Design an enzyme around this catalytic site. Structure first.
Site, mmCIF file in Angstrom:
data_model
loop_
_atom_site.group_PDB
_atom_site.id
_atom_site.type_symbol
_atom_site.label_atom_id
_atom_site.label_comp_id
_atom_site.label_asym_id
_atom_site.label_seq_id
_atom_site.Cartn_x
_atom_site.Cartn_y
_atom_site.Cartn_z
ATOM 1 N N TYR A 15 9.052 -11.065 5.424
ATOM 2 C CA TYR A 15 10.000 -9.840 5.851
ATOM 3 C C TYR A 15 10.311 -10.066 7.378
ATOM 4 C CZ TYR A 15 10.336 -8.911 1.035
ATOM 5 O OH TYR A 15 10.368 -9.113 -0.274
ATOM 6 N N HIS B 145 4.932 -11.620 3.703
ATOM 7 C CA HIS B 145 5.849 -12.018 2.528
ATOM 8 C C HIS B 145 7.367 -12.221 2.908
ATOM 9 C CE1 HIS B 145 3.060 -9.514 -0.271
ATOM 10 N NE2 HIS B 145 2.333 -10.432 -0.128
ATOM 11 N N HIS C 256 4.383 -3.593 7.069
ATOM 12 C CA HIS C 256 4.556 -4.852 6.439
ATOM 13 C C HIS C 256 4.835 -6.004 7.287
ATOM 14 C CE1 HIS C 256 5.454 -7.412 3.028
ATOM 15 N NE2 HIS C 256 6.146 -6.551 2.281
HETATM 16 C C1 LIG Z 1 7.119 -5.733 -9.064
HETATM 17 C C2 LIG Z 1 6.339 -6.276 -7.635
HETATM 18 C C3 LIG Z 1 6.574 -5.652 -6.400
HETATM 19 C C4 LIG Z 1 5.982 -6.100 -5.300
HETATM 20 N N1 LIG Z 1 6.318 -5.219 -4.307
HETATM 21 C C5 LIG Z 1 5.698 -5.389 -3.056
HETATM 22 C C6 LIG Z 1 5.802 -4.446 -1.763
HETATM 23 O O1 LIG Z 1 6.644 -3.677 -1.785
HETATM 24 N N2 LIG Z 1 5.128 -4.773 -0.740
HETATM 25 C C7 LIG Z 1 4.238 -5.713 -0.852
HETATM 26 O O2 LIG Z 1 3.787 -6.176 0.342
HETATM 27 N N3 LIG Z 1 3.918 -6.721 -1.809
HETATM 28 C C8 LIG Z 1 4.675 -6.368 -2.982
HETATM 29 N N4 LIG Z 1 4.329 -7.086 -3.938
HETATM 30 C C9 LIG Z 1 3.274 -7.653 -4.191
HETATM 31 C C10 LIG Z 1 1.868 -7.128 -4.692
HETATM 32 O O3 LIG Z 1 1.680 -5.893 -3.625
HETATM 33 C C11 LIG Z 1 0.670 -7.689 -4.883
HETATM 34 O O4 LIG Z 1 0.101 -8.218 -3.598
HETATM 35 C C12 LIG Z 1 0.782 -8.964 -5.973
HETATM 36 O O5 LIG Z 1 1.289 -8.537 -7.078
HETATM 37 C C13 LIG Z 1 -0.354 -9.694 -6.428
HETATM 38 O O6 LIG Z 1 -1.373 -8.892 -6.967
HETATM 39 P P1 LIG Z 1 -1.609 -8.708 -8.351
HETATM 40 O O7 LIG Z 1 -1.993 -10.009 -9.126
HETATM 41 O O8 LIG Z 1 -2.795 -7.672 -8.336
HETATM 42 O O9 LIG Z 1 -0.317 -8.106 -8.970
HETATM 43 C C14 LIG Z 1 5.284 -6.710 -5.077
HETATM 44 C C15 LIG Z 1 4.504 -7.309 -6.524
HETATM 45 C C16 LIG Z 1 5.126 -7.261 -7.749
HETATM 46 C C17 LIG Z 1 4.769 -7.840 -8.985
#
Ligand SMILES: Cc1cc2nc3c(=O)[nH]c(=O)nc-3n(C[C@H](O)[C@H](O)[C@H](O)COP(=O)(O)O)c2cc1C
Length: 362
Positions: free
Chosen positions: A184, A182, A179
């Protein structure tokens, strides 16, 4: 259509290009940050994905920033994840573990000893994390100002990633995703906005990328390069971490370095949930000519956008986040052009089975 054709992803072969993005759901047991059979059921339901990428998972107790996020550092965590991966494999799925250190997106109340979390520099994230209240429900809380890591603490961080990868391999994961996105810890070092260090781990882009490349090298050596992926969010702003004044050039430097290691994949998180400027096709072309593993795109994709970019030879696969929360059989739905289940955002974070394992298949 190419979405339903196989793809070699390092050591494993995905039967389709529709991947489950990493999704923090905050349903682990405390004390111990332990994955559960309920989590196992959730992942098993989604095993038709070309690849499942797990929720972000701590490399160490210090890595923790969210109450309810699982770890992969303790014997009990290893044992619980072993059951989960076995269940996914029984359903003919493939699962990667996303490994993180949250760095400054954390709170002292959940750190070892109740101490300030660590980062590249002693700068508050100026955002929130998710803790649990006295009833065990998710609550949003302002982040604690971090302590800057000492130079002599850096090898320990690299070792923690290495150790977590040894544990992940034992736990039966097919791949690991670092990771590095974002805001981190790895991204905190990459970004000039969060990294004001004046030693070998800050300043130049070479120095800012030094930690993540040490981690990549350590985990490739522990397992194999064809088992390692990395998630980056190197263009735009994510959780108050921008990518600095030379974001494109700095991204291309990192990607050329990653390519030298022959890693399995590069996963680009293109936008946060509020959206922003799309990647230029010129930038996508520059990435593609520099990296010779799989490229996964993510961030408010549609199947049609994924097909377009796959057809243009720019990406290989797409990861869906929220559509995977709500559609265990997303692959079948996209193949059949079926409607997608209505999402229930109130149950994304924390809780139990409701809004987790109760979204139906077709
Ligand atoms: C509830 C939630 C939790 C997420 N947790 C993570 C995570 O653990 N790691 C990460 O890299 N991105 C995380 N994200 C980002 C998602 O992996 C993804 O990149 C983002 O939701 C945009 O894609 P989508 O439009 O298909 O939802 C999270 C997103 C949501 C909505």
């Amino acid at each position: 259509e190419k979405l339903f054709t196989p793809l070699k992803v390092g050591a494993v072969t995905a039967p389709n290009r529709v991947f489950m993005a990493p999704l923090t759901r905050l349903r682990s047991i405390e004390p111990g940050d332990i994955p559960t059979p309920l989590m196992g059921e959730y992942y098993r339901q989604r095993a038709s994905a070309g690849l499942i990428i797990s929720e972000a998972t701590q490399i160490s107790a210090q890595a923790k920033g969210y109450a309810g996020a699982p770890g992969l550092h303790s014997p009990e965590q290893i044992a619980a994840w072993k059951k989960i991966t076995a269940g996914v494999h029984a359903e003919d799925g493939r699962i990667a573990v996303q490994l993180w250190h949250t760095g400054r997106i954390s709170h002292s109340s959940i750190q070892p000893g109740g101490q300030a979390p660590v980062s590249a520099s002693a700068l508050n994230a100026n955002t929130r994390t998710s803790l649990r209240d006295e009833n065990g429900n998710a609550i949003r809380v302002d982040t604690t100002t971090p302590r800057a890591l000492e130079l002599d603490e850096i090898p320990g961080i690299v070792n923690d990633f290495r150790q977590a990868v040894a544990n992940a391999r034992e736990a039966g994961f097919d791949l690991v995703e670092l990771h590095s996105a974002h805001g981190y810890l790895l991204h905190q070092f990459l970004s000039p906005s969060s990294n004001q260090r004046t030693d070998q781990y800050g300043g130049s882009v070479e120095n800012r990328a030094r930690l993540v490349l040490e981690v990549v090298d350590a985990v490739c050596n522990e397992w194999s390069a064809d088992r390692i992926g990395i998630r980056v969010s190197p263009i735009g702003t994510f959780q108050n971490v921008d990518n600095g004044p030379n974001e494109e050039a700095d991204a291309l430097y990192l990607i050329e370095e990653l390519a030298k290691r022959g890693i399995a994949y590069l996963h680009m998180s293109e936008t946060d949930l509020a959206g922003g400027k799309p990647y230029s096709e010129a930038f996508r072309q520059k990435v593609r000519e520099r990296f010779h593993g799989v490229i996964i795109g993510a961030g408010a994709y549609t199947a049609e956008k994924a097909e377009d970019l796959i057809g243009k030879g720019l990406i290989d696969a797409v990861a869906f986040g929220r559509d995977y929360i709500a559609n265990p059989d997303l692959v079948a739905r996209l193949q059949k052009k079926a409607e997608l289940n209505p999402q229930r955002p109130e149950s994304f974070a924390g809780g139990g089975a409701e809004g987790y394992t109760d979204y139906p298949s077709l």
